[PDB]
Design a protein around this ligand. Structure first.
Ligand SMILES: *[C@@H]1O[C@H](CO[C@@H]2O[C@@H](C)[C@@H](O)[C@@H](O)[C@@H]2O)[C@@H](O[C@@H]2O[C@H](CO)[C@@H](O[C@@H]3O[C@H](CO[C@H]4O[C@H](CO)[C@@H](O)[C@H](O)[C@@H]4O[C@@H]4O[C@H](CO)[C@@H](O)[C@H](O)[C@H]4NC(C)=O)[C@@H](O)[C@H](O[C@H]4O[C@H](CO)[C@@H](O)[C@H](O)[C@@H]4O)[C@@H]3O)[C@H](O)[C@H]2NC(C)=O)[C@H](O)[C@H]1NC(C)=O
Lengths: 212, 215
């Protein structure tokens, strides 16, 4: 069986990062550990990929991974990436194809919402980031603060929901940042950072802070 | 070749409302035209039961059948954590397949339900977002709905809302958001919108928080 994976959204949107398609091969036997990979971008073969050391599994199978570095603009422009796997236990090679989702890109709207009055009873309060109206669903969301590091030594404690298909064919998600009520009253500025293909510089940022 | 079994839990709203009929569903896939017969045996805490109902086998677009057996469960039985076991027999299986499902173990935790008005920056648009935060509940089985006192000429097809799936939070509990999209005029109009949350750990398995424009 073959599994072909897309690049990480944040990798395709930042020039400094390295996006890559990942072609995983499973059900590899001990008698047949040979695996060959052929990569094709829009049908044209490319030879920049790199195979990884075969991973022995606890169920007596191997896991063979082949990575291909892609150009950010190639993936965003919708070029197809095809992985071709050859093995003796396979009558013929397996070809999987992956590409970015089709459809006109749509720009996310980012809204920050303070905690409810009813939540201030608790020591931990919830800072909310609403990201709606974007397409495709590939997106990256993070939180930041201008707080000094001992205030958040282990970083910020936030979770983000997966994209949800909205009633108009676009996607939305929420990201929840949990902070102590004192650091909220302290006036610290917290920032929801959203990275998406349709944004200017693939990046936008919305802030949230208390006012005494 | 070989069939595969998948055992699914009841729907959260069905187990939390006494008026509803919750049921465990045992699905069998990759059943071929040859040997389409499938036998089911059900066991609640090991005790065999004969209350199940098999449904007519669905011919699939890949030349396989899909044979479904449903078992009605008692609201109290499921919430108390009884195990439901499905045993599938078919001439294509060297031996039967046994799948077991039950409610998640662990002390149930009560959700906190918070309603959030739209961001000031969203009022540019005719459609605005009313948010319901549901956090700190366990297990993840939950149902969320919205309601309003709005008139039908503004909402002829009902309310337009979507809810995220539960997300595991950093403390082992779950949280989700539910988004209700309404026209900005009906928000300014003073219409009252209500977030309804149904979970085993709530009083009467139900709670409701309101949201309306503040002057
Ligand atoms: C021939 O075609 C069959 C059905 O037709 C296909 O259906 C889908 C899958 C598309 O491919 C269509 O294009 C096509 O027509 C195939 O049957 C499917 O087999 C696969 C396994 O190969 C099953 O995958 C399993 O899916 C579980 C989820 O199942 C729920 O959600 C599905 C949506 O993805 C939905 O289709 C299912 O019907 C089911 O829906 C729930 O039903 C219950 C009761 O009926 C309801 O109470 C719920 O509300 C429903 N919920 C939803 C959301 O609809 C997974 O849970 C399961 O996971 C298991 O394995 C993974 C990894 O292996 C583990 O991570 C995990 O822990 C767990 O162990 C698995 O992914 C799929 O469900 C089957 N579909 C149906 C409809 O039965 C045949 O495989 C195919 N044969 C071939 C190609 O040879």
């Amino acid at each position: 069986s073959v599994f072909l994976f897309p690049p990480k959204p944040k990798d395709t949107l930042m020039i400094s990062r390295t996006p890559e398609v990942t072609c995983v091969v499973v059900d590899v036997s001990h008698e047949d550990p040979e695996v060959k990979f052929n990569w094709y971008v829009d049908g044209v073969e490319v030879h920049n990929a790199k195979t990884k050391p075969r991973e022995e599994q606890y169920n007596s199978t191997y896991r063979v991974v082949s990575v291909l570095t892609v150009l950010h603009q190639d993936w965003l422009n919708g070029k197809e990436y095809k992985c071709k796997v050859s093995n003796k236990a396979l009558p013929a090679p397996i070809e999987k194809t992956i590409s970015k989702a089709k459809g006109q890109p749509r720009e996310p709207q980012v809204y920050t919402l303070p905690p409810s009055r009813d939540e201030l009873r608790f020591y931990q309060v919830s800072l909310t980031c609403l990201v709606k109206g974007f397409y495709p669903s590939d997106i990256a969301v993070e939180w930041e603060s201008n707080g000094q590091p001992d205030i958040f030594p282990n970083g910020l404690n936030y979770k983000t929901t997966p994209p949800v298909l909205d009633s108009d064919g676009s996607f939305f998600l929420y990201s929840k940042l949990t902070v102590p009520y004192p650091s909220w009253l302290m006036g610290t500025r917290f920032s929801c950072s959203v990275m998406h293909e349709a944004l200017h510089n693939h990046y936008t940022q919305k802030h949230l802070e208390y006012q005494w």
